[PDB]
């Protein structure tokens, strides 16, 4: 059963550094990890714009093939719109993709795994963990 | 069969103005129109952040219950990533939500309904209709 939604930052870091501690976390949490299709979009963009697109696509492809990618669906959208409204009410900036990922996770009762705690910490109702 | 994806700006303008030209197109293309869940998210944000959230939510709900909302899925995400990267390389990006919508419509072979021809014109493989 899914428990963790990896944010884009954690995925980029993992891809770039292949860190030992993350590998251990991954192996322990196989089949409880997912990403949002929003994060998939960011990884493909990163691959495709880079200096080694075919090669970077293949790394991205092997990464996503090993976990679940969730469609960003109507409930994710609704939860995200609510969150953006409460953040506006508090004049707190969060980036557009981070917001969608937080809404996505919140719509599924998931913990967001992120190494940029400062951005996510001010989202109301957040649950977060940092694996770095 | 679905043929048309309405961009967010067209939705807002139709909600605020209920224009005759749009009503005619809507009736001509009943059951062939959709929005992306990305647009749904923006409309829910508009509603929730407004001075009359309950009222505006119901207007939105009535709009979306008469067409289809499509999930922003894996193919939408991939196609969006690819388009983003092409746009970066040519130095003509598009706003974040708009890019997603175009990528989503692209992945489904759908026509984007927008008044922002200049902006959307430049997205590769895109088909556009302005219903104003």
């Amino acid at each position: 059963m899914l428990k963790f939604m990896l944010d884009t930052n954690t995925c980029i870091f993992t891809i770039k550094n292949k860190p030992e501690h993350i590998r251990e976390r991954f192996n322990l949490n196989t089949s409880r990890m997912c990403i949002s299709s929003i994060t998939l979009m960011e990884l493909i963009y990163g691959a495709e714009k880079s200096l080694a697109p075919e090669r970077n696509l293949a790394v991205v492809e092997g990464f996503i093939s090993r976990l679940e990618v969730l469609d960003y669906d109507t409930q994710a959208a609704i939860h995200t719109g609510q969150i953006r409204a409460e953040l506006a009410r508090k004049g707190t900036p969060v980036g557009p993709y981070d917001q969608m990922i937080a809404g996505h996770a919140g719509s599924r009762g998931l913990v967001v795994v992120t190494n940029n705690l400062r951005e996510f910490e001010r989202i109301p109702g957040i649950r977060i963990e940092d694996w770095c | 069969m679905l043929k048309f994806m309405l961009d967010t700006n067209t939705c807002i303008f139709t909600i605020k103005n209920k224009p005759e030209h749009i009503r005619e197109r809507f009736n001509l293309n009943t059951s062939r129109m959709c929005i992306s869940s990305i647009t749904l998210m923006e409309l829910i944000y508009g509603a929730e952040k407004s001075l009359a959230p309950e009222r505006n939510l119901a207007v939105v709900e009535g709009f979306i219950s008469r067409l289809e909302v499509l999930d922003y899925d894996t193919q939408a995400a991939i196609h969006t990533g690819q388009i983003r990267a092409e746009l970066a390389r040519k130095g003509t990006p598009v706003g974040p939500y708009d890019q997603m919508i175009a990528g989503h419509a692209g992945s489904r072979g759908l026509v984007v309904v927008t008044n922002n021809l200049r902006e959307f014109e430049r997205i590769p493989g895109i088909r556009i209709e302005d219903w104003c």
Partner: peptide
């Protein structure tokens, strides 16, 4: 495995060296 991914092909050092969230 994840092990084979962690030990396999590496991304080029430029890959998303900035994330570019607008």
């Amino acid at each position: 495995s994840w092990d084979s991914w962690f030990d396999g092909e590496g991304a080029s050092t430029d890959f998303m060296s900035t994330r570019e969230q607008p």
